[PDB]
Design an enzyme around this catalytic site. Structure first.
Site, short mmCIF file in Angstrom:
data_model
loop_
_atom_site.label_atom_id
_atom_site.label_comp_id
_atom_site.label_asym_id
_atom_site.label_seq_id
_atom_site.Cartn_x
_atom_site.Cartn_y
_atom_site.Cartn_z
N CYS A 91 48.78 18.86 17.20
CA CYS A 91 47.78 17.84 16.89
C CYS A 91 48.22 16.42 17.26
O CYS A 91 49.16 15.86 16.68
CB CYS A 91 47.38 17.88 15.41
SG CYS A 91 45.98 16.74 14.98
N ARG A 115 47.66 13.15 14.37
CA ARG A 115 48.36 13.13 13.10
C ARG A 115 48.65 11.75 12.48
O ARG A 115 48.97 11.69 11.29
CB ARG A 115 49.65 13.91 13.25
CG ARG A 115 49.43 15.43 13.27
CD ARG A 115 50.74 16.15 13.35
NE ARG A 115 51.17 16.30 14.72
CZ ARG A 115 52.38 16.69 15.08
NH1 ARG A 115 53.27 16.97 14.15
NH2 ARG A 115 52.69 16.81 16.37
N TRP A 157 37.71 14.40 13.94
CA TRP A 157 36.80 13.96 14.96
C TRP A 157 37.33 14.21 16.35
O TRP A 157 38.53 14.45 16.56
CB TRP A 157 36.44 12.49 14.78
CG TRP A 157 37.60 11.52 14.78
CD1 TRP A 157 38.25 11.04 15.88
CD2 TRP A 157 38.18 10.86 13.65
NE1 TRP A 157 39.22 10.15 15.51
CE2 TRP A 157 39.20 10.02 14.14
CE3 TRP A 157 37.95 10.92 12.28
CZ2 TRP A 157 40.00 9.23 13.30
CZ3 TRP A 157 38.74 10.12 11.43
CH2 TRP A 157 39.74 9.29 11.95
N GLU A 178 38.18 16.78 24.91
CA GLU A 178 37.88 18.09 24.32
C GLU A 178 36.53 18.59 24.80
O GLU A 178 36.40 19.74 25.22
CB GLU A 178 37.95 18.07 22.79
CG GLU A 178 39.33 17.77 22.22
CD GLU A 178 39.38 17.77 20.66
OE1 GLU A 178 39.48 18.87 20.06
OE2 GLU A 178 39.32 16.67 20.05
C1 HEM Z 1 41.12 12.95 12.77
C2 HEM Z 1 41.25 13.06 14.09
C3 HEM Z 1 41.83 14.30 14.81
C4 HEM Z 1 42.08 14.35 16.13
C5 HEM Z 1 41.85 13.22 17.16
C6 HEM Z 1 42.61 15.66 16.44
C7 HEM Z 1 42.97 16.06 17.69
C8 HEM Z 1 43.42 17.30 18.03
C9 HEM Z 1 43.51 17.82 19.37
C10 HEM Z 1 43.12 17.08 20.68
C11 HEM Z 1 44.00 19.07 19.28
C12 HEM Z 1 44.25 20.00 20.46
C13 HEM Z 1 43.48 21.28 20.15
C14 HEM Z 1 42.56 21.62 21.28
O1 HEM Z 1 42.58 20.85 22.30
O2 HEM Z 1 41.87 22.67 21.13
C15 HEM Z 1 44.22 19.38 17.90
C16 HEM Z 1 44.70 20.57 17.39
C17 HEM Z 1 44.97 20.80 16.07
N1 HEM Z 1 44.68 19.96 15.02
FE1 HEM Z 1 44.05 17.98 15.14
N2 HEM Z 1 42.69 16.40 15.28
C18 HEM Z 1 42.21 15.59 14.24
C19 HEM Z 1 42.11 16.02 12.92
C20 HEM Z 1 42.78 17.13 12.40
C21 HEM Z 1 42.83 17.57 11.01
C22 HEM Z 1 42.07 16.91 9.81
C23 HEM Z 1 43.61 18.64 10.97
C24 HEM Z 1 44.01 19.54 9.77
C25 HEM Z 1 43.58 19.23 8.55
C26 HEM Z 1 44.09 18.91 12.29
C27 HEM Z 1 44.94 19.94 12.58
C28 HEM Z 1 45.10 20.50 13.82
C29 HEM Z 1 45.73 21.76 14.04
C30 HEM Z 1 46.38 22.71 13.01
C31 HEM Z 1 45.66 21.94 15.55
C32 HEM Z 1 46.15 23.15 16.33
C33 HEM Z 1 44.91 24.05 16.19
C34 HEM Z 1 44.94 25.17 17.18
O3 HEM Z 1 46.04 25.74 17.43
O4 HEM Z 1 43.85 25.49 17.71
N3 HEM Z 1 43.57 17.99 13.16
N4 HEM Z 1 43.86 18.28 17.15
C1 LIG Z 2 43.45 32.10 20.74
C2 LIG Z 2 43.46 30.70 20.18
C3 LIG Z 2 44.55 30.19 19.46
C4 LIG Z 2 44.51 28.89 18.96
N1 LIG Z 2 45.56 28.39 18.25
N2 LIG Z 2 43.41 28.12 19.17
C5 LIG Z 2 42.34 28.59 19.88
C6 LIG Z 2 41.11 27.72 20.12
C7 LIG Z 2 41.07 27.07 21.51
C8 LIG Z 2 42.38 26.36 21.86
N3 LIG Z 2 41.98 25.06 22.39
C9 LIG Z 2 40.55 24.97 22.62
C10 LIG Z 2 39.98 26.00 21.65
N4 LIG Z 2 39.74 25.36 20.37
C11 LIG Z 2 38.65 24.42 20.22
C12 LIG Z 2 39.08 23.00 19.89
N5 LIG Z 2 39.76 22.93 18.62
C13 LIG Z 2 39.64 21.71 17.87
C14 LIG Z 2 40.96 21.04 17.47
C15 LIG Z 2 40.54 19.80 16.68
C16 LIG Z 2 40.19 18.61 17.35
C17 LIG Z 2 39.78 17.49 16.63
C18 LIG Z 2 39.70 17.56 15.25
C19 LIG Z 2 40.03 18.74 14.57
F1 LIG Z 2 39.93 18.79 13.22
C20 LIG Z 2 40.44 19.85 15.28
C21 LIG Z 2 42.35 29.89 20.39
#
Ligand code: HEM
Ligand SMILES: Cc1cc(N)nc(C[C@@H]2CNC[C@@H]2NCCNCCc2cccc(F)c2)c1
Ligand code: HEM
Ligand SMILES: Cc1cc(N)nc(C[C@@H]2CNC[C@@H]2NCCNCCc2cccc(F)c2)c1
Ligand SMILES: C[C@H](O)[C@H](O)[C@H]1CNc2nc(N)[nH]c(=O)c2N1
Ligand SMILES: C[C@H](O)[C@H](O)[C@H]1CNc2nc(N)[nH]c(=O)c2N1
Ligand SMILES: [Zn+2]
Lengths: 407, 411
Positions: free
Chosen positions: A106, A109, A278, A283
């Protein structure tokens, strides 16, 4: 045992000590790195609890105190006679904020401590979950002024009584295979859309159909609900120079709300814990619109721009990529829905990293995910060495419920 | 053991068996991934196994494993290591060695080309003057009037490590950098240190934005010596843009031959510390990194200025817009002047076919994602969605410390 991260742009060297407090395993060995791979009982539980409670009591500067020791005893006695334990609210709030703090993938953070936490451990039915989720969506959306939040349903007990949200995000668009051979809507959501229709959904069969919730309570069969349409804020995509853009009929939703992950706090597992913040522009603009496996709109846009698509070397893909992303960002700002661009998102992460090294002794970071899918090296994170490791409390991926659950 | 890599775009799943032959260490542990860290004398004792491994591979590759010729070569190398403490490679083994170091270079996207390498055996070299002649012939063969040919020049191996051959330059062709008293830089900021050393050694610096550095060559552990590549051997491309005519007025040019001269070649436990090699550029190396890194020529501002983009808010993506145009300009200029170059779409698509072919014929392709993915437009290129397994096979190219840090000045 002590480790240096160097920034190759600023020549700044940071020292990581926090990794020695890491506990889970990475996928990598001394022989083989798996940095780029997306997915690499009663006794077991008490040390997990102790490890958490120690760190919690350390955070409120009461380490070793009587109140510390007494909780450690209480929890210890709860585990022995009940096989599990219940977190205090303060402990829950801390745990959740920290799972986010520890989310090495993330980039967002810097925000980690402004997390609204909703304690839904009193929930019993799927109907309960639907109420809690609507209130989450409403609170988080906040008329465009998005606020980060998480809703936490009851913890795993004996694994045959799990709460689960079957959607991968609270808000997503359906995917339908068509007689053509083509896909209508979002191809990432085909299988789930088919699980809905078979579970009774009246699918409208359009391109941006907001999917229903599939909610599972207490290990029971999942049931279906429609989010109130007036709660799903959506944004029509237009370009500030290209008048023709609107004519693709493109739209995206405001709330990214990951719903399929598992929260681990002090050995306790919360399997339904939707959370949201957000969007970072890329994305939607880069992944959701441009991935071959997604909405795949590069060809269409380039053709509207009248670029020479006869050869890769004219960078027509890259040209159209930028403009698709200008349009996403511009549309969100024009409707006053919170969105951050990838320059600003990464700038912020670099500052947060520096803070974490100064105040915590390090920050786990997955460079592969942190670097934006466009324009990598012009964002600072690209030049930032990062150390990836797994800390707890944590968010984990977990098997899609349909592969495992039985009816 | 079977390791499976997935492509999230196509769903093609591959299986790596080759990683079972990896010897070296990654820097990664079960507890930590160092996948994005840039940088994560041999006894008879430790040498014959390495010689043996390599010879086994070599003879297996020519379908001669276990032949009399294979056994006689093992025995022969064994005795040579015995009496002299090292051994000499046959030409065939050096050639095969060098191709494999390339084939094994996990950070290299250009490997579909690994088998086509021209090898220049310069093991008879004894002086810096000697080195200079070898390097000129390499620059000229490789450049080939713009129709670029990949090539490697290999100088004698390390013996006791007090008689090392080294090319002090990091690339054979590179532009000088000059730190100014006001704290700004003229030319390439990445070469300030090495520029100073050259000046110290006696080079008359022209002090312009694009001065081709002199070669600094150390032979046989001696102090290094200065040499000017003949200017007529240095192919350069002035940069212009297909639609924007003001782009030429920026004054940018770049050289055609990328030629890395600072790496170490390990074959059969032997160590080749001067082994400069070259191919051709991918456009993004010049247009993204060389021109647009803040710590390099840093031209984004000036370009976006001339385009009149909205530079008040980063959210207009002014930097992304200008970046694409800078890169369109590089590909255009090279193509127009007929100097080999490859765009990143074409290169990464090539690398993907290469990689799959390797998984069939070889059971794997060590690949480092952080490096394979280009520094612009990552996800619209097929490698982004490709899972990769990074591990070390020999022969290999290793980074080595810069010689001014280690060299014992002889006066
Ligand atoms: C508030 C603004 C936030 C931004 C700009 C943000 C941004 C991102 C981005 C760009 C990713 C890459 C995932 C992807 O591209 O699919 C990501 C993944 C992730 N975010 Fe953040 N996020 C935000 C809020 C949060 C919150 C509130 C949480 C948890 C409470 C969080 C937890 C995570 C986790 C655990 C991942 C990895 C998820 C996965 O493996 O798919 N994020 N976030
Ligand atoms: C198989 C598998 C594993 C894994 N860890 N994950 C995935 C979802 C895929 C990964 N990458 C694109 C898609 N997930 C969609 C985007 N996820 C949003 C992350 C995010 C952004 C802003 C604010 C938030 F609260 C959360 C699949
Ligand atoms: C034929 C044209 C070639 C192309 C387009 C190509 C492409 C590239 C690129 C884009 C990189 C990373 C760029 C960077 O960030 O520095 C790279 C790295 C590398 N390449 Fe290739 N390459 C080519 C030929 C070769 C040859 C002939 C060799 C050696 C025989 C080679 C060996 C390597 C090695 C060892 C690296 C890692 C460099 C380092 O660690 O600094 N490449 N290549
Ligand atoms: C610290 C450090 C470690 C390392 N392994 N390396 C470096 C040179 C860096 C890598 N990246 C920018 C700079 N050097 C850029 C030169 N690399 C060109 C690769 C190439 C391309 C086409 C044909 C070829 F034969 C070779 C520095
Ligand atoms: C194969 C590779 O691990 C995969 O494509 C990753 C690369 N980096 C990513 N980074 C983010 N933020 N999200 C992703 O889905 C991916 N996909
Ligand atoms: C810190 C980080 O590992 C470093 O910037 C790497 C990332 N990826 C790269 N990729 C290429 N091709 N060249 C590089 O120099 C780098 N640098
Ligand atoms: Zn690793």
């Amino acid at each position: 045992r002590f480790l240096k991260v160097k920034n190759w742009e600023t020549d700044v060297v940071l020292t990581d000590t926090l990794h020695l407090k890491s506990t889970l395993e990475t996928g990598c060995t001394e022989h083989i790195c798996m940095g780029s791979i997306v997915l690499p009982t009663k006794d077991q539980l008490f040390p997990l609890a102790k490890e958490f409670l120690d760190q919690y009591y350390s955070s409120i500067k009461r380490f070793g105190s009587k109140a510390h020791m007494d909780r450690l005893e209480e929890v210890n006695k709860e585990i022995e006679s009940t096989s599990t334990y219940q977190l205090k609210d303060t402990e829950l709030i801390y745990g959740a904020k920290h799972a986010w703090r520890n989310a090495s993938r993330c980039v967002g953070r810097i925000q980690w401590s402004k997390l609204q936490v909703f304690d839904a451990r009193d929930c019993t039915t799927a109907h309960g979950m639907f109420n809690y989720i609507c209130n989450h969506v409403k609170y988080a959306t906040n008329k465009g002024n998005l606020r980060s939040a998480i809703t936490i349903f009851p913890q795993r007990t004996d694994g045959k009584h799990d709460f689960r949200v079957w959607n991968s995000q609270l808000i997503r668009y359906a995917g339908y295979k068509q007689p053509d051979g083509s896909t209508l809507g979002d191809p990432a959501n085909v299988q789930f859309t088919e699980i809905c229709i078979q579970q009774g959904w009246k699918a409208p069969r359009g391109r941006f159909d907001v999917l229903p919730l599939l909610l599972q309570a207490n290990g029971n069969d999942p049931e279906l609900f429609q989010i109130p349409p007036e709660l799903v804020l959506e944004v029509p995509i237009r370009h500030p120079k290209f008048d023709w853009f609107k004519d693709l009929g493109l739209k995206w939703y405001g709330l990214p709300a990951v719903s399929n992950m598992l929260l681990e706090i002090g050995g306790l597992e919360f399997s339904a814990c939707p959370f949201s913040g957000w969007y970072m522009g890329t994305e939607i603009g880069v992944r959701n619109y441009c991935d071959n496996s997604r909405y795949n709109i590069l060809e269409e846009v380039a053709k509207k721009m009248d670029l020479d698509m006869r050869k890769t070397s004219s960078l027509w893909k890259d040209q159209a990529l930028v403009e698709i992303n200008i349009a996403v960002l511009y549309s969100f700002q024009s409707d006053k829905v919170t969105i951050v661009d990838h320059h600003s998102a990464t700038e912020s992460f670099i500052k947060h990293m520096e803070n974490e090294y100064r105040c915590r002794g390090g920050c786990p970071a997955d460079w592969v995910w942190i670097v934006p899918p466009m324009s990598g090296s012009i964002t600072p994170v690209f030049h930032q060495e990062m150390l990836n490791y797994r800390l707890t409390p944590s968010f984990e991926a977990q098997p899609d419920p349909w592969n495992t659950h039985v009816w």
